[PDB]
Amino acid sequence: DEVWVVGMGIVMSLIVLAIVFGNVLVITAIAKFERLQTVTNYFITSLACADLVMGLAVVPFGAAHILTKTWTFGNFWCEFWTSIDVLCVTASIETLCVIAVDRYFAITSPFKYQSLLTKNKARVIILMVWIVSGLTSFLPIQMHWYRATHQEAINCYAEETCCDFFTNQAYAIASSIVSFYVPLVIMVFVYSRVFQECKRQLQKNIFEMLRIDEGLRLKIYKDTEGYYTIGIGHLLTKSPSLNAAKSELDKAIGRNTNGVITKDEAEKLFNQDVDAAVRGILRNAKLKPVYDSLDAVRRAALINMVFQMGETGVAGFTNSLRMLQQKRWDEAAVNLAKSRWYNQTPNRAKRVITTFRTGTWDAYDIIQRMHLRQYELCGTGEHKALKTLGIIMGTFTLCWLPFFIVNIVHVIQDNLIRKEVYILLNWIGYVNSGFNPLIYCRSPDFRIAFQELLCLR
Numbered sequence: 001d002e003v004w005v006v007g008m009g010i011v012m013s014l015i016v017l018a019i020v021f022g023n024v025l026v027i028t029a030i031a032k033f034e035r036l037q038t039v040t041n042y043f044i045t046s047l048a049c050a051d052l053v054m055g056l057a058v059v060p061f062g063a064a065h066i067l068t069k070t071w072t073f074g075n076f077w078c079e080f081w082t083s084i085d086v087l088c089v090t091a092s093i094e095t096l097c098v099i100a101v102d103r104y105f106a107i108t109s110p111f112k113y114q115s116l117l118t119k120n121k122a123r124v125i126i127l128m129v130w131i132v133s134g135l136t137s138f139l140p141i142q143m144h145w146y147r148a149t150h151q152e153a154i155n156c157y158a159e160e161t162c163c164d165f166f167t168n169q170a171y172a173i174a175s176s177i178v179s180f181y182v183p184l185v186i187m188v189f190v191y192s193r194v195f196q197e198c199k200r201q202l203q204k205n206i207f208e209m210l211r212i213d214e215g216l217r218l219k220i221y222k223d224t225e226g227y228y229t230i231g232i233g234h235l236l237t238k239s240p241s242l243n244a245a246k247s248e249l250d251k252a253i254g255r256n257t258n259g260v261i262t263k264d265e266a267e268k269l270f271n272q273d274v275d276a277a278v279r280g281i282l283r284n285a286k287l288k289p290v291y292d293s294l295d296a297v298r299r300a301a302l303i304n305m306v307f308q309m310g311e312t313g314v315a316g317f318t319n320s321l322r323m324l325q326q327k328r329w330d331e332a333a334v335n336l337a338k339s340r341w342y343n344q345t346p347n348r349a350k351r352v353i354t355t356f357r358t359g360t361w362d363a364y365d366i367i368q369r370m371h372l373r374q375y376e377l378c379g380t381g382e383h384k385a386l387k388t389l390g391i392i393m394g395t396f397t398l399c400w401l402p403f404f405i406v407n408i409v410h411v412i413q414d415n416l417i418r419k420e421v422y423i424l425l426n427w428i429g430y431v432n433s434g435f436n437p438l439i440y441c442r443s444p445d446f447r448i449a450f451q452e453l454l455c456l457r
């Protein structure tokens with residue numbers, strides 16, 4: 001029937017056109033824009049390249065082979081064509097695994113992120129992915145390490161006009177694990193913690209702020225009052241014996257620290273110190289009305305003062321807390337600069353005052369870079385957390401999971417999987433290459449770049 005060909009002709013061409021136009025726009029956006037050249041976007045460029053070569057060489061010949069029902073481009077070029085298809089899917093999915101690891105690595109340890117991931121270490125990751133992708137698709141095919149299972153399969157290889165997909169048990173499972181199952185469990189476990197790490201996204205901003213204002217020390221340091229503290233202003237014990245400071249540290253940490261702890265262990269002690277401090281702000285009758293009127297960023301600035309002076313010291317600003325409850329920011333910024341706390345730590349009080357003025361993360365450059373990547377990936381609340389993380393994992397799942405499951409089950413029992421269903425489920429995987437430009441490019445700079453290249457407003 002003419003209709004079904006036309007239907008395939010218009011649907012398959014739509015997928016080709018949508019994949020190409022989406023990837024070309026993403027590639028040309030990062031190329032002709034300077035603010036869009038972040039190190040996080042250095043990895044998404046490999047995602048679009050692995051997806052553009054898909055829509056330019058893999059998807060087009062995928063539709064041409066189905067419509068004509070026979071290959072008409074030589075057998076070597078089909079071995080070449082099959083190689084590109086696997087090389088791109090491997091380079092696409094493994095890049096999706098890199099994108100998830102990259103954005104998680106910056107959330108947990110933000111300070112190290114700007115120190116390790118440079119231009120060299122960014123290209124090495126992309127180089128390693130395409131090398132792993134190239135060594136699992138091209139070389140096993142150019143060496144004929146996949147075929148020769150049955151007598152029937154041999155005939156289609158010798159014929160220069162026949163080209164189907166017949167692989168043995170070894171390459172069918174090995175390629176599926178390297179391409180899909182290894183990046184799957186990683187992306188599943190990474191986003192499982194990303195959703196868990198975002199459950200306290202308000203405390204993480206306070207942690208990175210107090211690391212600049214107060215200061216994190218992994219080793220036990222004596223305080224000015226003569227007592228031993230650890231991490232960020234966390235008192236170990238008021239006894240002047242260092243032996244008691246080690247035993248108290250072992251109980252809260254849970255191991256033999258001998259004085260030295262790690263970053264995440266001090267960060268977990270920070271969560272107990274904040275929850276014990278926020279309850280104190282709600283406990284004090286003078287700090288609760290101020291806390292109810294402050295926004296999220298200024299609530300952290302109020303807790304910043306509690307970690308330095310305490311609920312007794314923060315309550316000592318009758319004029320400032322009075323204007324904070326009345327939402328008078330610029331007036332409260334002057335009376336805070338007149339107190340004794342501003343005179344002893346002017347560089348810290350200014351950043352706290354600047355936070356109370358604008359309500360942004362200004363004067364904390366690293367923390368402001370966090371809010372952009374946190375909201376882009378997670379969002380604000382429970383309704384936004386499962387939504388954004390769900391569609392990023394849902395699109396990657398519904399496209400490639402039904403194929404590789406069918407691909408692996410086919411090796412279990414022959415003739416159990418229909419060929420037409422096998423092609424459709426592989427084709428559903430291609431559509432994921434067209435969705436990625438509209439999934440990972442939701443950055444504010446991407447929105448500015450996309451609306452400018454299309455002459456929008």
Ligand SMILES: Cc1ccccc1CC(C)(C)NC[C@H](O)c1ccc(O)c2c1OCC(=O)N2
Nearest residue numbers: 082085086089164165171172175176179423426
């Ligand atoms: C050539 C032909 C003929 C009929 C139907 C489809 C096709 C195209 C083919 C099968 C080459 N698509 C490759 C498929 O996207 C794919 C991607 C990554 C992989 O790791 C594997 C994989 O195939 C199974 C596997 O074990 N590994």
